[PDB]
């Protein structure tokens, strides 16, 4: 069944990595609100 | 020129609108009116003919801003 | 060190606030 | 949060001392004095 | 079970190229669970690599990725997967050879990317065996009729050979057409290798036995290649088909650029009243006309 | 009907309980469905006193009310009682029932089930359900008395949790990883693997406290005592407060142990404080023993209780004991003098002849446990003069340490400060 | 859809990468 | 084919030990090395031959190892003693108990005693049994010379020479008397002032005293002064760039934006 395993590896590292920015810049957003 | 470089943000962004929004969320509450004025522009240039929902929901409070 | 330990405590007081502000907020919004 | 299961499971502030000595000062004091 | 690799290691150290062989045979076969242990010992496998040990340059060059493998230097652990030769053993469920293939995939897409700006002379070679690798699992993408995602690593991977007999070789040939050209358009930014790709894609629409030509015209006009459509219209004009030719003419008018649609003008001016009536759908006068009617 | 009267309060108890589980399958979803991360965390806390209260005739109306869609496999469960990440937290309710039914066969394949399912499924949410899973078929495989072809399985497990970037379920696997090669005795492949694995500087409180607890016993038998100490002392202020009670008499066991080699004498408020007294009374008399360099009173304890040690594990730390225990004679003697003569040391150590007090002395210096010089041109053993550090880097290296420790913590509290929106 | 996805979401990633670099700067200079 | 070959094995070995049960040895034990390659070295689970393999195991590995210390070759004797340890402790179940093990085991103690591998001795002492520590002599021997010489009674640890339970702890005792003065040798320069060169003699137990020169003029301690044998013990400005850097480390951690 094809590089369904190389495409999902390299989807999740980048899931995993697009979450915790998001929850960053959320952060920095609110003290610049501040 | 702070206004042109908020502006020309805008005209990068139009081939994915929902993007726009977020560049642009984050500018609109500065303490520089100019810089205000360019996220609303680029906001209009971005989801231009689009009616982008959160585009929208940015502009409104705006339309309330002390500077004319 | 004394400055860097009442900064230290200031942080995670203000960890908590917030924390207790986004639980009272996620309690609220399901109920 | 967990209770580790894999591990099975006087009033006095004491600090040593507890050792075994010809009385403390008494018996130790009078043969001080014998000898001296 | 065993409780210890020391004494499996401790074979290495023997003067006997017969007793290495299955020194090296239990060590792969149990690297899976004593890895820790023969991190320390795989200084001795690397010179045995490195010399002509019998099985020494295959096996050997193995367990030395396994070993590396589990400890986590993958850059090094490829440098002795892509040697380990045939025993890699692309086909199979184990995790150490997805997650080999996996850094193989990615440093050959490195390397590509890499070398792809350089020169045409002097790029950096690639690793014909990790280059076999990659195409053993290009391979088994078209196999598993899985013709999709063929197109993506393609593409990341900078090979249009590929792209083209993927492509090519699958069903629905103008779903994969469609799908590359929105990925064409939207996603890669590079745009030498944007226009690389659309050439191929051009190329591929050609080819069809029932030719599209509103998506070829499209793909023109990101080239900016004005003589090709002026004959390819000249083609449909010779060739009777009139809607076809108008139809692109009009799309070519909304899209192209003014110096592109005088480009085409002057190489088509270059019965005759077809070729004026699409001369003045290019220029805009039916276009403006049935806007303002609008 | 006093047994019906008690079984309906039980059951409305009940009710309370499933509603409670109902609310942890809400708050996984909130992750999942919401698709953030974490907060299997806040549906997981929960875990220790919902087994507590587990029920027989709860779980059977579970395993019918439950599971919305069906697929049948539900009758792996319903013989023997009688979504992505809800079904692995309701299989490990289930191998919950077994282990405290004592039901170890059905538990163990269960749990093997259980274990397929959650490597098949490639999830990044539900690698904390994979943790938790892990533990408890260790435990169960622990009650059976195998804990060996669990080591493979845990082993490429933790290989899986290490290529996949993964923090719960790695600390989990290489805890329990050790847990099985401390309970076969293998110190060697337990150091090397704690060599050659990096904990998560992000883990678990309670995980930190046994991997903590882990190295130091591998330190400790290894011989690296000063890092075995504060390997423990640091498990030990880690641990929990109100609960593991088990844990913290082993920890503070061993931590006995390895300050009684380096020559220390412990501090009696352990012995004191009341979860504790029963546990680690043989250690009260082994200390005292030591304390007096009684080697009489330290032969009785070993005769008296000698199986407790082998029990709990220490019967070689306790005569690296006897060999610690002429050291700490010598660091009281040490810490209390600066100038003894070797002919007053033989005596005040309980030795034989000022050449024995040359060797043990210059022994003691050579590990440094006493720190002073020695002359033997007169026969005296001179301390160093303590020089007043204040005029010294020592006060430099101290608050740069404690600063960077102030520092980090302001860094991540200000960060984890998340906003919903 | 895996290639779409994969790449959408990588040019999140740069995209969120440059969003946290300007609000940086913004802090920066409105401390001052 | 497996009857035959295990024939053939059993014949090597028997004529092994009509040899000696020195070099015929040698290339007996390398031959029975190849055929036990051809046959099982390490079970390795699975296969689960319950052959009774230690039987040939044991046969192979002891009398490899024995004739390792007959040679006086630590890098074989290493080798052996690694089989066999695997052999010992991993198929217990299978493995009759062979009464000829704790031999070589405690002879493995001792050479780690005599390579000064304190970490990896009292890794093996743990991997053995709790009563064997205190019953057998082959063990209890290497036990009593490590206690010893990690208390400090260097004398006992001499003292002890002519106490061997087997002859065969040999060479591992000249090793550890090596190592021994090596160890002094350590206390020596790290902790003291100025021995002279009588006291020297009487503390380290050198050779006769015309070599005494011996570990001077290898170790060297600088020696020399005033009496040849005066050990010339081998016993203020701010750190400004290391402070400078840290100071800077702090400035920095409180400055960006975090």
Redesign the interface.
């Known amino acids: 069944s094809g590089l369904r395993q190389y495409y999902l590896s390299k989807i999740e590292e980048l899931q995993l990595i697009v979450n915790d920015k998001s929850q960053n810049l959320r952060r920095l957003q609110a003290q610049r609100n501040e | 020129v702070r206004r042109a470089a908020v502006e020309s943000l805008g005209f990068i962004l139009f081939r994915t609108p929902e993007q726009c929004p977020s560049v642009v969320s984050l500018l609109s509450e500065s303490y520089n009116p100019h810089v205000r004025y360019g996220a609303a522009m680029a906001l209009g240039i971005c989801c231009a003919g689009t009616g982008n929902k959160e585009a929208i929901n940015l502009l409104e409070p705006m339309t309330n801003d002390p500077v004319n | 060190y004394l400055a860097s330990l009442i900064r230290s405590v200031v942080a995670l007081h203000n960890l908590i606030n917030n924390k207790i502000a986004n639980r009272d907020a996620e309690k609220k919004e399901g109920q | ?9 006087h009033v006095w ?4 001392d ?2 075994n000595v010809e009385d403390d000062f008494s018996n130790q004091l009078r043969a001080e004095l014998e000898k001296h | 079970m065993i409780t210890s690799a020391a004494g499996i290691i401790s074979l290495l150290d023997e003067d006997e190229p017969q007793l290495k062989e299955f020194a090296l045979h239990k060590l792969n076969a149990v690297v899976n669970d004593f890895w820790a242990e023969i991190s320390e010992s795989v200084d001795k496998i690397e010179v045995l690599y490195e010399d002509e040990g019998f099985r020494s340059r295959q096996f050997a060059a193995l367990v030395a990725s396994k070993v590396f493998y589990h400890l986590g230097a993958f850059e090094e652990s490829l440098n002795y997967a892509l040697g380990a030769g045939d025993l890699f053993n692309v086909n199979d469920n184990s995790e150490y050879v997805e997650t080999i293939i996996a850094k193989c995939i990615d440093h050959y897409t490195k390397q590509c990317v890499e070398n792809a700006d350089l020169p045409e002379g002097e790029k950096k070679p690639i690793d014909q065996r990790l280059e076999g690798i990659v195409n053993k699992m290009f391979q088994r993408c078209l196999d598993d009729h899985k013709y999709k995602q063929a197109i993506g690593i393609a593409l990341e991977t900078r090979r249009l050979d590929v792209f083209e007999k993927t492509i090519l070789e699958s069903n629905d040939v103008p779903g994969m057409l469609a799908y590359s050209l929105k990925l064409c358009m939207s996603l890669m930014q590079n745009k030498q290798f944007r226009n690389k790709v659309l050439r191929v894609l051009v190329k591929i629409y050609m080819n069809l036995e029932k030719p599209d030509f509103i998506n070829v015209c499209q793909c023109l006009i990101f080239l900016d290649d004005p003589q090709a459509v002026s004959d390819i219209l000249e083609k449909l004009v010779k060739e009777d088909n009139l809607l076809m030719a108008y139809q692109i003419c009009f799309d070519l008018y909304e899209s192209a650029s003014q110096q592109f649609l005088s480009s085409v003008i002057q190489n088509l001016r270059t019965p005759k009243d077809q070729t004026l009536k699409m001369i003045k759908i290019l220029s805009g006068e039916m276009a403006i006309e049935l806007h303002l009617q609008f | 009907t006093a047994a019906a009267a008690a079984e309906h309060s039980q059951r409305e108890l009940d009710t309370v309980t499933l509603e409670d589980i109902k609310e942890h399958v809400k708050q996984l979803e909130k992750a999942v469905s919401g698709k953030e991360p974490r907060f299997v965390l806040r549906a997981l ?1 929960m ?2 006193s919902t087994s507590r209260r587990l029920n027989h005739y709860v779980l059977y109306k579970a395993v019918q009310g439950f599971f919305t869609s069906n697929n049948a496999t539900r009758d792996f469960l319903l013989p023997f009682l009688e979504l992505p990440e809800v079904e692995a937290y309701l299989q490990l309710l289930v191998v919950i029932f077994m282990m405290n039914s004592k039901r170890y066969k059905e538990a163990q394949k269960i749990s093997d089930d259980l274990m397929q399912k959650i490597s098949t499924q490639n999830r990044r949410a539900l690698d904390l359900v994979a943790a938790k899973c892990y ?1 408890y078929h ?2 169960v495989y ?1 009650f059976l008395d195998k804990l060996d072809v669990v080591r493979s399985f845990l082993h490429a497990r933790l290989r899986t949790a290490t290529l996949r970037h993964d923090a719960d379920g790695q600390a989990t696997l290489l805890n329990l990883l050790l ?1 099985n090669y401390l309970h076969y005795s293998l110190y060697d492949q337990a150091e090397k693997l704690v060599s050659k694995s990096v904990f998560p500087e992000q883990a678990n ?2 995980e930190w ?2 991997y903590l607890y882990y190295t130091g016993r591998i330190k400790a038998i290894q011989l690296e005592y000063s890092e075995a100490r504060r390997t423990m002392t640091n498990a030990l202020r880690k641990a ?1 407060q109100h ?5 913290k ?2 920890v503070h066991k061993l931590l006995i142990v390895v300050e009684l080699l380096l020559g220390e ?1 412990p501090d ?2 352990q012995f ?1 404080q009341p979860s504790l007294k029963r546990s680690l009374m043989p250690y009260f008399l082994l200390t ?1 023993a030591v ?2 360099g009684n080697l009489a009173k330290f032969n009785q304890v070993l005769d008296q209780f000698g199986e407790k040690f082998q029990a709990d594990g220490t019967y070689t730390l306790i005569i690296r004991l006897r060999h610690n225990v002429i050291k700490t004679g010598v660091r009281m003697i040490s810490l209390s003098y600066s100038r003894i003569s070797l002919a007053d040391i033989a005596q005040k150590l309980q030795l034989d002849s000022p050449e024995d007090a040359e060797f043990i002395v210059a022994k003691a210096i050579r590990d440094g446990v006493i720190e002073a010089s020695i002359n033997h041109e007169k026969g005296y053993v001179q301390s160093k003069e303590m020089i007043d550090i204040y005029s010294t880097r020592e006060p430099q290296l101290a608050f740069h340490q404690r600063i960077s420790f102030c520092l980090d913590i302001h860094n991540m509290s200000v960060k984890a400060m998340r906003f919903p929106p | 859809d895996l290639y779409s996805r994969y790449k959408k979401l990588q040019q999140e990633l740069e995209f969120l990468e440059v969003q946290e670099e300007y609000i940086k700067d913004e802090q920066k200079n409105l401390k001052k | 084919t497996s009857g035959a070959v295990l024939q053939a094995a059993t014949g090597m070995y028997e004529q092994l030990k009509g040899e000696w049960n020195l070099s015929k040895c040698g290339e007996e034990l390398g031959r029975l090395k190849l055929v036990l390659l051809e046959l099982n070295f390490l079970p390795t689970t699975g296969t689960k031959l319950t052959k009774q393999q230690l039987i040939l195991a044991r046969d192979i590995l002891e009398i490899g190892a024995q004739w390792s210390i007959l040679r006086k070759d630590i890098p074989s004797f290493e080798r052996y003693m690694a089989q066999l340890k695997c052999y010992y402790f991993d198929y217990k179940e299978q493995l009759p108990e062979s009464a000829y093990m704790h031999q070589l085991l405690g002879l493995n103690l001792l050479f780690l005693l005599s390579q000064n591998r304190v970490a990896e001795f009292h890794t093996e002492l743990e991997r053995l049994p709790a009563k064997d520590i205190q019953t057998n002599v082959y063990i209890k021997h290497p036990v009593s010379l490590e206690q010893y010489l990690m208390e400090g009674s260097y004398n006992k640890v001499f003292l002890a020479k002519g106490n061997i339970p087997a002859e065969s702890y040999t060479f591992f005792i000249d090793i550890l008397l090596d190592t021994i003065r090596d160890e002094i040798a350590g206390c020596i320069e790290k902790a003291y002032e100025k021995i002279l060169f009588t006291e020297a003699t009487r503390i380290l137990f050198f050779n006769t005293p015309k070599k005494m020169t011996d570990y001077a003029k290898k170790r060297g301690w600088v020696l020399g002064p005033n009496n040849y044998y005066s050990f010339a013990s081998q016993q203020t400005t701010i750190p400004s760039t290391e402070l400078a850097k840290q100071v800077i480390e702090y400035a920095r951690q409180l400055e960006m934006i975090v």
């Open positions: 949060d967990d209770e580790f299961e894999e591990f099975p499971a502030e004491d600090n040593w507890d050792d | 806390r875990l220790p533990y260790a435990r622990e847990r409180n309670n406290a046994r929990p609960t593991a009670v088990g844990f008499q082993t004498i009696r408020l004191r005292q304390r007096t």
